Amino acid sequence: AVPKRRKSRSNTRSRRSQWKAAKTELVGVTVAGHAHKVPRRLLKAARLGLIDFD
């Protein structure tokens, strides 16, 4: 099966705009006084110092 004809700009764009990244929600944490923002699932690691904030 091969495409019968090339898609139109609108038809291509409607599908192409659905390929996007989901944004992760971030919470606030303070380590050694400095305050950072981390994803909530890493809150325990951030508190215990296993997170390298760079």
Place this chain on the structure above:
Amino acid sequence: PKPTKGPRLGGSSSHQKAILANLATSLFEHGRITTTEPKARALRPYAEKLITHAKKGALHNRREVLKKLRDKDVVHTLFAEIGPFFADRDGGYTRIIKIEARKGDNAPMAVIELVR
């Protein structure tokens, strides 16, 4: 414990068996291990059962542990420090902490450690 539902780690079930044994050995040797999150979740009950054998701490239990672990030094420390340390605690000997995923494949990672 409860068998894996779905495909076994590292390819086949024999490889999964080897993987669990090696991870348990490393965990008892170092007290703390960093690995992939599915592997840590699979390891937890497997390791706690061995710690229970060590808490019982008889010759029969030692043979049972040796049925799985091949590192005799790790077996010795498991029966001489780990079991006595956890004598007074009933279950829940380990702990899983989720950490940042690694590059290359974005695999979610975690650390698993003995409680103390």
Place this chain on the structure above:
Amino acid sequence: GKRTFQPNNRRRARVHGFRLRMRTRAGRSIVSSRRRKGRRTL
């Protein structure tokens, strides 16, 4: 699964070399024609 080109330097020389070409007038004309065209190798 054997391909057509099996290299052999001595056979290549003895089948397509300078001394082979110079032996006949056809080969001499081939050499002269490549000289005329300006090829680096004859």
Place this chain on the structure above:
Amino acid sequence: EYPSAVAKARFVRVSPRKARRVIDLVRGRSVSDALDILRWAPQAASGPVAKVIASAAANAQNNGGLDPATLVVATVYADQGPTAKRIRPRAQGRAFRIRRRTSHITVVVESRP
């Protein structure tokens, strides 16, 4: 309208579509929020984009002397750069082409209360 600073990253070796996927996450946000959104974004293109945004903020603070705490990512987009062509051999002697696309990433930050 607002005081602003510009930064550009030309010939970055990431496909423009892949760069757009992460740029759309931070367009319009403040610099501080955009930086950590890109920090925790798992996509690989989050690195170069974060570098450009940080460089633009640095330009504003150094050359323009603007307060970093009021900087907002106002404009950001990714154009196509030059494309290099390679060849991937396929079955039965066919040879297919491969494109190594690059991007030009432009960021404008402006300071506003």
Place this chain on the structure above:
Amino acid sequence: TLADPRDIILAPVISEKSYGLLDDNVYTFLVRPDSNKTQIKIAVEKIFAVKVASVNTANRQGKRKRTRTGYGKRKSTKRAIVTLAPGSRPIDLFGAPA
């Protein structure tokens, strides 16, 4: 027209291996690629007024390098390794102490 032995010996080889051999009293030279062992032995004996035990030769092909679009080949060299007689006066390379 008149032949000089110094036309055969071109220059000494300077490298870690050559410096190692210098302690053993063995000298490495670059020679004209057409020469042979006996001619080299005669020439060294004449030049340095020394006694030569034996001569070892080796041909080395030149390296291929590419410059902008094509490959060019460096020149091929011949090295002669000369070991003096057991108790001969050393050859003073005049700057190669090892």
Place this chain on the structure above:
RNA sequence: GGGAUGAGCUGUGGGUAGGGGUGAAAGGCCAAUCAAACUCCGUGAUAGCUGGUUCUCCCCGAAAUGCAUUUAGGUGCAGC
């Protein structure tokens, strides 16, 4: 799955060249192409056949019939 001490398998070197070779014979093979290889030249081969042939406006405006034809999807003369 067949042969596997034989009309065996195989390495190295050599020989047979295109209306020619070679063939325990299939028109098989002769450098991934063989009812006559490949390359260059004659050469811008030929094709009653297929396709294409690029700016504008004004005036007029058909034929698909007759005869002949190695002729019928071509063409000559007539007709328009």
Place this chain on the structure above:
RNA sequence: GGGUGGGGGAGUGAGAAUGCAGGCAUGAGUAGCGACAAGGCAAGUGAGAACCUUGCCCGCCGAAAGACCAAGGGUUCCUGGGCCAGGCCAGUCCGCCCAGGGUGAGUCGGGACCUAAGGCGAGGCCGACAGGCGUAGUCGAUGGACAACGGGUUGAUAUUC
């Protein structure tokens, strides 16, 4: 570098030839990422590590997936650097890039020794020309003859030092 006018000359006008060359879309962030031996942890290096280095486990080959040659390739070998191209991912690594270094024989494999099939071939015979064949001879190993073993050493050669 152009405009206008009187003349002169054209490679003078493209949308279609499954036309030619270059650039760029659609399919689409899709298929695929090349055998069914299998990887793990600790430590290190680093801006960056699933892939690099070290250690310890686990697994696979073992008439090979080990060790030597010949043919073929040609510096791919060693050391020190490198990391925008290449490696079907990343790479601090590399059979990739850069510079320098490295191959030592009276006895090993060949020539300087010998000939087979076959090649060339003084004269020669034959053939309008072109040329065909061939004697003397001379080449041509896959064969005949012919003298070395053990150990050590370099980052890289060794029956060669």
